[PDB]
Design a protein around this ligand. Structure first.
Ligand SMILES: Oc1ccc(Br)cc1Br
Ligand SMILES: Oc1ccc(Br)cc1Br
Ligand SMILES: Oc1ccc(Br)cc1Br
Ligand SMILES: Oc1ccc(Br)cc1Br
Ligand code: SF4
Ligand code: SF4
Ligand code: SF4
Ligand code: SF4
Ligand SMILES: [Br-]
Lengths: 419, 443
């Protein structure tokens, strides 16, 4: 796979085409959070926050021995098991995505972490960097990223166009039990300051924050192929906890090297754009970043840092041209969310960021199918050619973290492919 | 014939029964007696002769090595930047671990109930932790829980009935009102007792495990071979450290799955009881001269954690693939040990010192001598693991009829940073060893 990636390397330069209308995008506009999309009826006709309506459908399916919408399970025991696996997968994730910056697991400084306090006598986080060479730092930090659970890792210069204009967060002293009821907006700004810092009014990223490190965290193929049923929910969930552990591990390594690091998971900015600029893959009709190793069946997280690094080259292995004629995801999508038309610079609704050339999809239509089906769908990922019953999954092949030994050698790494 | 770990385990399976041989002087072991915690072993000199808590003396040596451009004792790094990078990797590995091992029960990550966890609160409307189990069949439960264990990062997973002999008589913990920044100064002992109660519970006086807590699930978490072979230097410390955070994630993930199936679950990592003995009884491997559990897939180069539960399960069979007989003639770890902690003599029932639990047949090692080498070397050593022939990736051969051990096996850090790596430090040349189907999860 290291041969393929260098064969398809582009010359330097962001491959996302923009016009002069593009503005940074307020995170509150996503379908998950925006008031126009947030409330959906359950199967009884009661309007609730969308994820609560989806909970009601999970309960109804368990009671009726189903693994998904009109998908009978082997028995009620099997239906329960898939939802127990899904729920457990989310253990290391706050409120579905860890999006609040500088809260809970997503701290912008390591100073208060238990690990940092235990290691304080060594002083790694206070000691100036011993390495400033971007070539050596790129090799060190990619090695560390693989130790930290990334299946893919890439580096790009930080394009501020993809950083949210304002983040969704909670006040710093609000306890977890009131968090969902007290979400607020807060601007993300760049200023001449030494370190990332949060004031009462602003999330402040330093102007020295030059780079973003993007990780790809592979999902399980057999489980995602059960979309829109529960086992596709389970591989999604487990990878969100893998994302959180990756951010914390890598931020701690970068801090202990003498630099600062900002974790993010699903917060701070748009992962698909960063992933394309870092060379992990190409944008697609469904909207995801499609990778040569995994297609779109991979989750993304990212870390921002002033650590000197060598940016990776973007890659072109023909996704744009394949998506022009394929349209399989658009035809299988249960909610008709994915367009069959051509790419434009004009968003279809508030949930899209206008000003960038992309396939414009209706993401309120997508979210609307989640309470109906009681899961996170994923049909588009499952049917995509680049990605290539539930009892057979539970009785079938599995390996550590759901990785597959039949393909795991595609992500082996030596120095030559790290820098 | 190409390697097959399921075949190897089937060939060397033994009939049911704890393989560990015990006599009448066996008593449960107070966790405070470990060398990490006991007053007789806790204090060690640093390189200036100052007597400190052992891990602070080791800190002093780490700082000294970075300043002198060293990756380990008298091992020169490429430069100071490389020395710094190895210790930064090591320190970051420990991010999801409290005070080196997560040993305090029902504190921090090791909660004995899920009710207060953020994930449980988020999922409360579904009621999975309050709904009675929909499956009580131990066969199906074993398949489900082992599948979940592999999702949760276990490279090996096994089940045994819980043997209370290996549960610590008293735990090392902290009072519930002590915050993290004073934890190291306020450690106490607290008894672990078994009583007729419905759920695991902690009182001011006791940690109470229910009499219904029938089973223990043991996980192996594979370390990286290239990094451990640098023992006693810094990169061996780093693969150790990352695997402790993997252990913690495993426990939390699996306990939540078990709870959401309608049962209770107790995490432990390095706490609650003796991992090697549980691992032997659950069939992950055999005890060895060095004292670790040696597995067919990884040798001793694998970490262990375990979860206790009332969930009905099918215990696995123990395995005997000849480790005892190899250790009887090998002695490589004993001869290479930089502190001479590992005995070259026979197994006995008599502990060498307070750190050993007497009354069980094992090789008796001086674990105060081992720990004394850690401040000297600035790390967690691991030379015994590195030199053990079972840590080699290719010890197994097939003779056309069956599998056997290759007896011939018993006769630098810059290149590691520049060399092969893959997700979580796993090795794709060997990752097929741990593929799993229903047939090898439950019989
Ligand atoms: O990104 C997500 C946010 C919330 C839920 Br519920 C599922 C996903 Br996937
Ligand atoms: O006295 C101490 C100071 C720092 C640490 Br880290 C541990 C102890 Br004990
Ligand atoms: O088990 C351990 C406890 C403390 C340290 Br420091 C290292 C290990 Br390995
Ligand atoms: O009102 C609520 C009740 C339970 C949960 Br979980 C989330 C909300 Br918002
Ligand atoms: S997740 Fe499902 S509903 Fe959403 S776009 Fe994909 S196929 Fe359509
Ligand atoms: S299914 Fe086809 S059109 Fe959709 S993202 Fe995949 S390749 Fe592109
Ligand atoms: S860790 Fe090192 S000092 Fe300890 S027993 Fe093994 S070889 Fe000896
Ligand atoms: S080095 Fe030899 S004696 Fe020591 S544990 Fe390994 S096989 Fe046994
Ligand atoms: Br202490």
């Amino acid at each position: 796979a290291a041969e393929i990636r260098q064969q398809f390397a582009m010359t330097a330069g962001s491959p996302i085409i923009v016009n002069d209308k593009l503005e940074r995008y307020a995170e509150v506009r996503t379908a998950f959070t925006h008031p126009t999309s947030f409330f959906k009826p359950n199967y009884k006709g009661e309007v609730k926050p969308w994820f609560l309506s989806a909970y009601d459908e999970k309960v109804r399916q368990i009671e009726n021995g189903e693994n998904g919408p009109k998908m009978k399970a082997k028995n009620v025991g099997e239906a329960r098991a898939g939802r127990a696996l899904e729920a457990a997968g989310w253990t290391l994730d706050i409120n579905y995505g860890n999006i609040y910056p500088n809260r809970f697991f997503m701290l912008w400084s390591g100073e208060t972490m238990t690990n940092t306090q235990l290691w304080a006598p060594v002083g790694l986080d206070r000691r100036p960097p011993d390495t400033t060479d971007p070539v050596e730092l790129t090799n060190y930090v990619k090695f560390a990223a693989r130790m930290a659970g990334a299946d893919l890792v890439g580096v790009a210069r930080l394009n501020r166009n993809w950083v949210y204009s304002e983040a969704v967060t909670i006040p710093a002293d609000v306890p977890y039990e009131q968090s969902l009821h007290k979400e607020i907006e807060k601007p993300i700004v760049f200023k001449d300051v030494p370190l990332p810092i949060e004031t009462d009014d602003e999330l402040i990223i330093p102007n020295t924050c030059e780079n973003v490190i993007v990780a790809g965290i592979a999902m399980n193929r057999e489980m995602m192929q059960t979309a829109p049923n529960s086992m596709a929910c389970a591989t999604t969930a487990f990878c969100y906890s893998r994302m959180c552990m990756f951010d914390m591990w890598l931020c701690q390594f970068i801090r202990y090297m003498g630099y600062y690091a900002i974790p993010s998971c699903n917060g701070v900015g748009q992962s698909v754009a960063f992933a394309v600029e870092a060379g992990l893959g190409q944008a697609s009709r469904m909207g995801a970043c499609i990778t040569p190793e995994f297609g779109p069946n991979v989750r993304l997280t990212k870390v921002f840092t002033n650590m000197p690094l060598v940016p990776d080259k973007p890659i072109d292995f023909g996704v744009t041209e394949f998506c022009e004629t394929c349209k399989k995801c658009a035809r299988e999508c249960p909610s008709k969310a994915i367009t069959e038309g051509p790419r434009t610079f004009e968003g279809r609704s508030i949930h899209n960021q206008s000003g960038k050339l992309q396939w414009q999809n209706d993401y309120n239509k997508c979210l609307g199918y989640w309470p109906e089906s009681g899961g996170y769908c994923g049909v588009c990922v499952a049917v995509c050619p680049f990605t290539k019953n539930i009892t057979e999954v539970w009785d079938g092949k599995i390996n550590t973290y759901g990785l597959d030994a039949d393909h795991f050698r595609d992500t082996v790494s030596f120095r030559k492919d790290r820098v």
